[PDB]
């Protein structure tokens, strides 16, 4: 999949495209409707399916450091776009271009001159141009004859509007199950594993993996979650009895540095391993409990054992729910 | 108007004075009663009207960094004193002098030896001398024969006690209208304009002016306010269509750095300007709304347009209320 | 009293001991039951009475920077142990040894090989060995024949469980009287006195002593307390009219730096002194009031005088309660 | 003078203009040659004299926080351009536009479509377009009359923003001033320091951010002016008069810079006012003091030396202020 | 290869082993002599080749934050040991064990009870036990065949972790590489910088913590490789190919280090990928730039010099990468 | 000894006194001449010997955070004054009083009204009143008998707070001690470091703020004393005995100072105790270590050198401690 930063990086000999445009933060189920429609039309006419997206977040251009939390990193947005069949992503920076352009010139410059589009797919909530004057309705009238426009309704399901906003609200409440339901997959983060408390292995109380994430990353509320930890493909040696590319059952503690840097510390069920130096994916399945303070090692280990018990039950159920479950996983029936 | 720092800076040949003594933070309507009485008596007897005030705040001498927030800067206290007819301000630093003096020696040294006063005006709540032993009643008895004393009742109006404390409470609640009512003018701050989000001009979403204030400055609660922005007299060129010395209608967003440094970002109605490098006065008129987070540029601009609508209405009313309104102003009837 | 850090520092020719094992944070009334039983048995058999304790806190090994607040410093734990008749303290660091040992090998290595114990005294809640598998019951069965075991019930009195946890809860609520009741003494801190607001002496509003404590130190909730300040033995000269080794009546303000560094500022009743450079012990007796903000020096001094009035009453009562009262004290009947 | 941020801010009805282009940092004597040529032409033809300049500094776009120190602020660059008769400044941000463009489309977009220029004045070192391909040579060929002006050499010294920054960093403010064609200055609010009659408390305390070019740490002779204000002044100073001053430039150790001004023969405290400090000559390097007696002695010597140096500056009145206060002795 | 943290992590059923012991920082050519001897023996006897190493660095236990800079990370130490055929690494933390022990009980506890060693390979400088009393001499007497290998001297230079750190600190990466027996490298994620087609925006921006040994600030010729990934790549680079690159090493002033790579003749942005940067030779010391023209000119000269140096590296292909991209000219 | 903060704290019924005035930082041998003369007179006449001193340092009032480093703390200044027989110290804060006053009213307010002095002893360098106008000369004329004592010169060296600070900054503690008339020392609480029997873990770890004068970074021979306490001591040290020690002075890089004491032939941990560290002579400059073997070797050499130097100090017993512990060998 091609990735272009700014209109000037798009190949001049681009022949034809079907285009979808949006922030696409999270690539949730509504976003997938736009992408699927774009891919389908591109196939039909023998064109490239192109996503136009935005980095930095358009809100951050007006209100620096008050933009919405990123449901996914830009990199994972690319990975998700590719997985749903996008052939190219054009990333637009509103501090560089297209911020002060009229709706008419926006379409002329972006859709026609740059992308040579024959079809554009946008959500009902789409806006564009100076002071957000262009709407989904405007785009339909501006693109009369010149190219076909498919405006897709926002997705309402089980009485909830699926949007980046609603996914962020679920995460903030610790309702990862509802977040997952709206995303169409397990919410996840990926990152390197650092040195933490003790060394991973025989001690139940030392995490298998310690990670830190910056305060622009959307994470579930502080607490303990059932989930799956996967060591991403690697030839580096692994300390202990975990293999790369397998989803291992884990109890995951999300915390906040006492400093809004967040910690994600994973306790892998029934395994003795230390994952320092590896890149790992952590997917969240369900909430287990709120954070609490411990007054003794005995009490700490007791609560950890209960976390393991409930995690095992939640994950045994997740494996059945199954469109989301991992293809290759490890979960023991008991300790 | 003369400004003296410490008793030693007062001219030795000072002939005669009528004196008022207090912190005078805010120079609110009660303070104005003390000042007006002092100016009147000074005129009658051909004397100088002198304010004795205190910097740092007397509370900060005992409890550093727990003094009350400054309603105005010391500099603006001077400007306000001058505007009500004070001829000289004596600024006393309790870390340097007069902290451990008996009431008797306080009067002897300050009022007689230093200021050569024939009249003193104080509020009913006045205290002085070591461990605050001197009261308004004490001053009357100590100054028998030697000089006349006028003790003025604290101001109660519309069932509220007008004091620096009550003004601070109104500001903290976001009730700038009540603060203004107690002050007898629009609450304001002045400062240099810095570089902020984007550049001021055609974009409705970029502030016309970005400012920052230290955490010792009393400001209204975080939120959006209707008010007036004035570029103070200057020969420096101005980017865009604002002229110096005119009060321009503005929607003002008061925020807090996510760090208790406060931001004041002003969106000037119907103008396209960037005020970087200029000193500006921002006066607050009324509360418009609480702060909120924005999930899209469309939503942000929508709320900003509603802020403008309500600001225009509040300011059209302010112009009529009129003892406070600015003498030279710009406010369009519509966008 | 001997203090050994780690098993390797214990004398190889140690002949015989009666041992008690625990964190012992606070050396509260329950802890004293364990210590008293250990001292008694050691005397009976002509052995050394040994405390095995832990630093860092065992919880901090698993959850760094989330361990419980220290009721006392390690140093004061030593001082308290000595005062109840302990002959030696062995300090174990679980990052260095005994963390991953089986219960059987824990007893073999620590109690037999290192301490040559003939008797061990533990609380009903005692655990030991890898993943806390050893209990008070396990210890009894493991030590069959080899050495006698006395397991002492946790102390319940007046419907409260006396534990380090309950003492910490009382302190956090500002209930120093209940904390004191559980400890069997006045809760106290000791530290050097630094330069603070003004200089101690004639001014009622300047503290006699300013102190700061790190955020790992358990202190009562922010507010004002009645208590006793003692200058610890010293030949250094003392500014003002306080003598070393006398408990002086004081109103103590506990605060928090606006930074979780805590301040303890003591206003010594009826004394004029500045304690810069001295080490001082501050013991808490009862809560007087919550913290408040002051808008004037008059108001500040008024509240301070009321603090003195209530402090004098609370301390006059404390002197009668008397098992805790200080042996040598200064408290005037009136100002 | 108008100020436009970006090409889209420029009025569409701009009928005609004479344009000069450059960073113009310091608006030194070489820059004045370009501006003077641009203004003379415009006033001759009744057209607007336009300066195209750059913020952030073009280097900082490639190397953030490794750009050269600002000889003046952008605000003072506007003030100086206006003082030399420029009618409009267009400020270009290379992170927003005119970066990836070729020389051909740079000239078409900027000079023709945006500014409708009939005349353009540039330095011999001028470059433009992607990879700095465009040169003063490349501009001439593309038609719009083009005046290319040699870089200024005087007394064997190349006058450039670089050579001015060198003089300042070395503490040689006299040479800096000679290259600038005026006294180097900074302007800013006065903050609280230590308050007067006492010789050792500064009349004014100021701090500056680390991107501001200042002379090397040391003591300098200069002039302090209170900028026009109706606000009251504590002590015996009046606004809009240049007062003789010994100026101590320092660094906050363990690079926020301090500029503390001791005004000669005046007893005043300038807290809250905006003040202009112009530097005339170097007096001495920084030193540490072990007693008050020593400090006050060296300060009296700073004053003596300052009087002499400023007396000379007044006589060679080309750069001296028009209304000033300076006593011959205490 | 297995990795065991502490003696208690080692399998109890470890029947037999050939062991080498040391800090092994950098796994330089002297270290390879020890590892090669340990591996040859084990493969001969069908036993496990074991490396006992130390984290934290033994010096840091006595002098926290005064330990020598890490030539490689502990992770790269594992990767290198595995590359030379080591079957297990035992990592010892001296704050947990083997510190207060005598030489006798060190050997008994570590080599006999834990590793069941029949052969041990150590450097002539090896010491152990409390107060570094144990020596290579003291090890021989205690029976387990012991091979003590002289420290490596080549071309009149002692090859040690110390001499490698010296070469790096001086900017002499060529000599560092000669002592290492490979190109010195670092690996890490690429972060955001300034985004391409523009020569002056780096292809990849990286930062490193202050315990990482890096060459002296300056510009170096090297190779950048995108580590194996299925993630998409922006621009015309493929994973697992070594691309020619001019690498600028810098320091965040007022010691976080930056490593910014300008990949020759490629237009790409490697944000979010993990990248290996190997250093071949020094090009130039750091310098400041006063214009874009100057910056781009020096960058073109960096590219020219880099092409030449890398051409030489390719020819002397002992340390050169197996699959690489390098153009003879623009 | 009484301690009064400000003139208003002094008892009104103070009937008579002999006064000395000065900063008295370090209470060096020149200061002792003034104090001795003041005490002898008072004890002769049965009056109080009074020292008027200054906090903050008078320089810091003019130049905050540019004052000279404190040779001792104010607390140790009180302790030293008391040790030389001073009956009261009056501490003057120049930001509170005696600043704007003339020489005449300074003497009237301080010496007559406040202290009721019949005798005053000052150094030849003494100044007072606004702008340091008052001198030792100006004091004599104003009647109160006045003894002005020359500054101390010995072995061709001027003994002053300045020359003591110079010796310390250079690492020449022997010369500092000679000028002081005692071993230079600091006192403070011992904090946690790395815990013993191990030679390389310090017996005591301390930190000091950046206003404390300390010798240059390096290793020194000295004595460590645990100050009187009933608190238990871990290991084989007793309170109130001076133990031989190798003392490492260091700086927290990227200026908090460390003082880490390795007590000879003792196995102890002094966490939580207050400790006095006195410096006798310089052993070596700081160096970096690349191995534990090297570190322990140099530490053994530090111990050997320390034994020799302290043996000499004991013999020339004028500055040596009265009760000490020092072994001739391990």
In this complex, do C68 and A295 lie within 8 Å of one another by their Cβ atoms?
A: yes
D272, two tokens:
């809250």
Residue D292 with chain F: CB contacts under 8 Å = 58-59, 62, 127, 132
F190, two tokens:
């011992």
Cβ pair E280, E309 in contact under 8 A: yes
F95, two tokens:
């930001």
**C-alpha of E132 from chain center:** 26
Count, residues in chain B: 335
In this complex, do D96 and A95 lie within 8 Å of one another by their Cβ atoms?
A: yes
Name the minimum distance, in Å, from the CA of A127 to any CA of chain C.
44
Way it was determined: X-ray
Rounded to the nearest 10 degrees, the angle between the axes of helix B176-183 and helix B164-173 is 160
Among chain C residues, the shortest Cα distance to A301 is held by: C131
Among chain D residues, the shortest Cα distance to B198 is held by: D5
Count, residues in chain A: 335
Residue A201 with chain C: CB contacts under 8 Å = none
Residue A208 with chain E: CB contacts under 8 Å = none
Query: Which of F219, F293, F301, F330 to mutate to probe the E interface, most E CBs <10 Å?
Result: F293
- Encode C6-26: b = buried (16+ Cβ within 10 Å), e = exposed: bbbbbeeebeebbbbbbbbbb
Name the minimum distance, in Å, from the CA of D259 to any CA of chain B.
19
Query: Which of A78, A239, A273 to mutate to probe the E interface, most E CBs <10 Å?
Result: A239
Residue E74 with chain A: CB contacts under 8 Å = 276-277
Strands (E), chain A: 2-5, 17-21, 48-54, 88-92, 117-123, 127-128, 134-135, 148-152, 156-157, 160-161, 188-192, 209-213, 223-231, 239-240, 247-256, 262-268, 273-274, 279-289, 329-330
Q: Please, which residues bridge with residue C274 across strands? A: C239
- Backbone phi and psi for residue A60, each to the nearest 5 degrees, phi listed first: -65, -20
∠ CA(E318), CA(E322), CA(E323), 5° rounding? 150
Cβ pair F44, F13 in contact under 8 A: no
Residue A200 with chain E: CB contacts under 8 Å = 5
SS3 state of residue C317: helix
Residue E125 with chain F: CB contacts under 8 Å = 291, 293
- Encode C128-142: b = buried (16+ Cβ within 10 Å), e = exposed: bbbbbebbbebbeeb
Chain B residues within 8 angstroms (CB to CB) of chain F: 8, 95-97, 100
Burial of B178 (0-12, 13-18, 19+ CB in 10 A): middle
Helix (H) or strand (E) holding E195: none
In this complex, do F200 and E62 lie within 8 Å of one another by their Cβ atoms?
A: yes
Among chain F residues, the shortest Cα distance to D288 is held by: F66
Resolution in A: 2.0
In this complex, do E132 and F194 lie within 8 Å of one another by their Cβ atoms?
A: no
How many C-beta atoms surround the C-beta of residue D297 within 10 A? 15
- Backbone phi and psi for residue A44, each to the nearest 5 degrees, phi listed first: -50, -45
Nearest to D100 by CA among A97, B290, C119, B46: A97
Residue D115 makes CB contacts below 8 A (sequence gap 6+) with D10, D14, D17, D19, D50, D52, D90
In this complex, do E6 and A199 lie within 8 Å of one another by their Cβ atoms?
A: yes
Q: Please, which residues bridge with residue A230 across strands? A: A247, A281
**Partner chains of B (3+ C-beta pairs under 8 Å):** A, C, D, F
D215, two tokens:
């002379």
F117, two tokens:
């002095």
- Backbone phi and psi for residue C302, each to the nearest 5 degrees, phi listed first: -60, -45
In this complex, do B65 and C301 lie within 8 Å of one another by their Cβ atoms?
A: no
- Tell me the CB-side half-sphere exposure of residue A320, using CA atoms within 13 A: 4
Partner residue opposite B237 with nearest CB, options D3, D232, D235: D3
Which 3-state string (H, E, C) describes E308-330?
A: HHHHHHHHCCCCCCCCEECCCCC
E303, two tokens:
């590219």
Among chain D residues, the shortest Cα distance to E201 is held by: D62
Interchain contact A/D (3 or more Cβ pairs less than 8 Å) = yes
SS3 state of residue D130: helix
Name the minimum distance, in Å, from the CA of D210 to any CA of chain F.
19
Cis status of the peptide bond prior to A56, with omega within 30 of 0: yes
Spatial separation of the C-alpha atoms in residues D57 and D162, rounded to whole Å? 14
Among chain E residues, the shortest Cα distance to C96 is held by: E96
Q: Please, which residues bridge with residue B52 across strands? A: B21, B90
Name the minimum distance, in Å, from the CA of F7 to any CA of chain B.
11
How many C-beta atoms surround the C-beta of residue F231 within 10 A? 16
Partner residue opposite C197 with nearest CB, options B62, B99, B165: B62
F86, two tokens:
């001073």
Among chain A residues, the shortest Cα distance to E96 is held by: A198
Partner residue opposite C296 with nearest CB, options B59, B61, B99: B59
In this complex, do E200 and D58 lie within 8 Å of one another by their Cβ atoms?
A: no
Among chain C residues, the shortest Cα distance to F11 is held by: C240
Among chain F residues, the shortest Cα distance to D200 is held by: F62
Query: What are the start-end ranges of the H helices in F84-195?
Result: 103-106, 136-141, 161-169, 173-180
Partner residue opposite E293 with nearest CB, options D61, D64, D127: D127
Among chain D residues, the shortest Cα distance to B92 is held by: D195
**Partner chains of A (3+ C-beta pairs under 8 Å):** B, C, D, E
Spatial separation of the C-alpha atoms in residues C106 and D284, rounded to whole Å? 72
Residue E61 with chain C: CB contacts under 8 Å = none
Rounded to the nearest 10 degrees, the angle between the axes of helix D173-180 and helix D161-169 is 160
Cβ pair D145, D118 in contact under 8 A: yes
Name the minimum distance, in Å, from the CA of B50 to any CA of chain F.
23
Spatial separation of the C-alpha atoms in residues D266 and D198, rounded to whole Å? 10
**Partner chains of E (3+ C-beta pairs under 8 Å):** A, C, D, F
In this complex, do A73 and E3 lie within 8 Å of one another by their Cβ atoms?
A: no
> Which residue has 């580096």 as its token pair?
A236
Interchain contact F/D (3 or more Cβ pairs less than 8 Å) = yes
Chain B residues within 8 angstroms (CB to CB) of chain C: 23, 58-59, 61-66, 68, 95, 99-100, 125, 127, 130-132, 163-165, 168
In order of E223, E227, E240, E268, the CA distances from E321 in angstroms are: 8, 13, 10, 21
**All structural domains of chain A:** 1-186 (3.40.50.620), 187-330 (2.40.30.30)
Among chain B residues, the shortest Cα distance to F99 is held by: B96
Partner residue opposite B82 with nearest CB, options D195, D228, D232: D232
Strand-pair category, F157-158 with B188-192: unpaired
Nearest to F265 by CA among F220, F235, F227: F235
In this complex, do B203 and A100 lie within 8 Å of one another by their Cβ atoms?
A: yes
Residue D235 with chain B: CB contacts under 8 Å = 3
Partner residue opposite C204 with nearest CB, options B131, B165, B168: B131
Spatial separation of the C-alpha atoms in residues D183 and B118, rounded to whole Å? 51
In this complex, do F75 and C236 lie within 8 Å of one another by their Cβ atoms?
A: yes
Nearest to E185 by CA among E160, E206, E155: E206
Query: Which of A62, A106, A130, A215 to mutate to probe the B interface, most B CBs <10 Å?
Result: A62
- Backbone phi and psi for residue C2, each to the nearest 5 degrees, phi listed first: -80, 145
Among chain E residues, the shortest Cα distance to A278 is held by: E75
Which 3-state string (H, E, C) describes chain B?
A: CEEEECHHHCCCCCCCEEEEECCCCCCCHHHHHHHHHHHHHHHHHCCEEEEEEECCCHHHHHCCCCCCCECCCHHHHHHHHHHCCCCEEEEECCCCCCCCCCHHHHHHHHHHHHCCEEEEEEECCCEECHHHCEEHHHHHHHCCCCCEEEEECCCEECCEECCHHHHHHHHHHCCHHHHHHHHCCCCEEEEECECCCCCCCCCCCCCCEEEEECCCECCCCCEEEEEEEEECCCCCCCEECCCCCCEEEEEEEEEECCCCCEEEEEEECCCCEECCCCEEEEEEEEEEECCCCCCCHHHHHHHHHHHHHHHHHHHHHHHHHCCCCCCCEECCCCC
Taking only Cα atoms into account, the Rg of chain A, rounded to an integer number of angstroms, comes to: 22
């Amino acid at each position: 999949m091609d990735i272009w930063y700014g209109t000037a990086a798009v190949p001049k000999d681009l022949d034809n495209s079907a285009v979808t445009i949006g922030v696409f933060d999270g690539v949730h189920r509504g976003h997938q409707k736009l992408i699927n429609a774009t891919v389908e039309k591109a196939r039909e006419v023998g064109a490239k399916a192109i996503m136009v997206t935005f980095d930095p977040h358009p809100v951050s251009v007006f209100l620096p450091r008050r933009a919405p939390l990123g449901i996914t990193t830009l990199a994972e947005r690319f990975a998700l776009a590719e997985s749903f069949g996008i052939d190219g992503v054009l990333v637009i920076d509103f501090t560089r271009e297209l911020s002060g352009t009229s709706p008419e010139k926006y379409v002329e410059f972006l859709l026609e001159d740059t992308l040579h589009a024959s079809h554009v797919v946008v959500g009902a909530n789409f806006t564009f141009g100076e002071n957000a004057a262009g709407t989904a309705d405007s785009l339909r009238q501006i693109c009369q004859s010149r190219l076909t426009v498919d405006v897709i309704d926002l997705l309402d399901d089980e009485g909830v509007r699926i949007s980046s906003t609603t996914v962020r609200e679920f995460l903030s409440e610790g309702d990862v199950a509802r977040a997952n339901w709206a995303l169409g997959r397990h919410f996840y983060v990926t990152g390197p594993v650092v040195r933490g408390a003790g060394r991973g292995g025989k001690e139940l109380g030392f995490p298998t993996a310690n990670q830190y994430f910056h305060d622009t990353v959307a994470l579930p509320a502080d607490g303990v979650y059932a989930g799956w930890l996967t060591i991403l493909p690697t030839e580096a040696p692994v300390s202990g009895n975990m293999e790369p590319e397998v989803a291992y059952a884990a109890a995951i503690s999300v915390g906040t540095n006492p400093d809004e840097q967040r910690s994600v510390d994973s306790f892998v069920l029934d395994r003795d391993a230390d994952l320092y130096g590896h890149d790992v994916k952590v997917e969240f399945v369900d909430h287990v409990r709120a954070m609490e303070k411990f007054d003794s090692v005995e009490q700490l280990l007791e609560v950890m054992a209960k976390d393991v018990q409930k995690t095992r039950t939640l994950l045994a159920q997740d494996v059945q729910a199954h469109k989301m479950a991992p293809e290759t996983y490890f979960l023991q029936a008991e300790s």
